[PDB]
Design a protein around this ligand. Structure first.
Ligand SMILES: Cc1ccc(-n2nc(C(C)(C)C)cc2NC(=O)Nc2nccs2)cc1
Ligand SMILES: CCCCCCCCO[C@@H]1O[C@H](CO)[C@@H](O)[C@H](O)[C@H]1O
Length: 333
């Protein structure tokens, strides 16, 4: 049957949600923390901002719903629910998404203090285990960072994406290179790990260029093999036109850390993205010895990007989104 909806005025706009969801309290630009009476779980509720106003809003709406509906893995965020006040397509004009409210992001847990190696082990293992899953579906996250990592009291971790942040980007995204592979997320993880171990930000750039200067200082300049892959001429000639920086030995940056952590850091933060360690490979590194289970590091059913890269009319994306809402099966809990 249809649930019963109650109306409320949260964050400069009117929210309408099933009575099941209580204690509705805002947390960000829009997302509300809430308590779900049917299950006993603490949930995040997201009200889509004008989901069907533009072609881009409609496209964005359908993508996010489809993607989460396919996401079923312990270290990735998943849909607990999705609903609308609408009783028909014609009146369909608001979309709500429910997920676990883990408790904190990876900033609240760190609060700029050195975490123990055992604690790092566990968090990074969770990130990577989730990345292997995301990547096997052929999906690249593109914006990994601590604000996008949901963690509870017990350090259980889920990767999400709340659509300076620049501090964890692979250099290629910054440089608007257009062919990206999965290992951009691996650069971000390296930067994240480093931050948990030493307690400070790895590349705390002040701007776009500063961000790049700091990166080159740690990993050194491009070697001959990397210059060979630069598609542009001026860029090619610019890189040559510098003080050749010698790749710093990470053991001299991370003093007193687990050498297994250092080794893994050497392998993640390689400038040439074709030479970075994959998630699947990283899971098998000796640093996760105490957690690694090759029979419990699942992959995703294949995922269609193209259906998102389409050009349809607004009414079509809306109808496609509605169907997605109507066909939803909650995960048994
Ligand atoms: C346009 C668009 C499309 C997809 C996403 N992605 N991608 C992911 C992956 C599965 C981590 C890649 C997760 C999300 N979304 C997400 O976490 N949403 C959330 N809702 C409520 C609390 S957190 C975001 C925006
Ligand atoms: C200015 C110094 C920073 C430039 C180094 C970034 C190069 C990243 O590495 C590159 O990633 C590309 C994009 O996915 C791949 O196609 C290339 O094979 C790889 O070399």
């Amino acid at each position: 049957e249809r649930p019963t909806f109650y109306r409320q005025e949260l964050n400069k706009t009117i929210w309408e949600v099933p009575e099941r969801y209580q204690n509705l309290s805002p947390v960000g630009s829009s997302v509300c923390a809430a308590f779900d009476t049917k299950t006993g779980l603490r949930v995040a509720v997201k009200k889509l901002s004008r989901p069907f106003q533009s072609i881009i809003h409609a496209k964005r709406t359908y993508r996010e719903l489809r993607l989460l509906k396919h996401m079923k893995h312990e270290n990735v965020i998943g849909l607990l629910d999705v609903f609308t006040p609408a009783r028909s397509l014609e009146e369909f004009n608001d979309v709500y998404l429910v997920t676990h409210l883990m408790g904190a992001d990876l900033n609240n847990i760190v609060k700029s203090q050195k975490l123990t190696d055992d604690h790092v082990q566990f968090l990074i293992y969770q990130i990577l285990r989730g990345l292997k899953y995301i990547h096997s579906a052929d999906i690249i996250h593109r914006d990994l960072k601590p604000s996008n990592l949901a963690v509870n009291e017990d350090s259980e971790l889920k990767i999400l994406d709340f659509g300076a942040t620049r501090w964890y980007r692979a250099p290629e995204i910054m440089l608007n290179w257009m062919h990206y592979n999965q290992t951009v997320d691996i650069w971000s993880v390296g930067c994240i790990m480093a931050e948990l171990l030493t307690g400070r930000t790895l590349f705390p750039g002040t701007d776009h260029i500063d961000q790049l200067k700091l990166i080159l200082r740690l990993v050194g300049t491009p070697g001959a093999e990397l210059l060979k892959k630069i598609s542009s001429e001026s860029a090619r000639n610019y890189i040559q036109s510098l003080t050749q920086m010698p790749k710093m030995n990470f053991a001299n940056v991370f003093i007193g850390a687990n050498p297994l952590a250092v080794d893994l850091l050497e392998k993640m933060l390689v400038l040439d993205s074709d030479k970075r360690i994959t998630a699947a490979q990283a899971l098998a590194h000796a640093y996760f010895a105490q957690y690694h289970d090759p029979d419990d590091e699942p992959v995703a059913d294949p995922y269609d990007q193209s259906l998102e890269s389409r050009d349809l009319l607004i009414d079509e994306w809306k109808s496609l989104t509605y169907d997605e809402v109507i066909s939803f099966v909650p995960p048994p809990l």
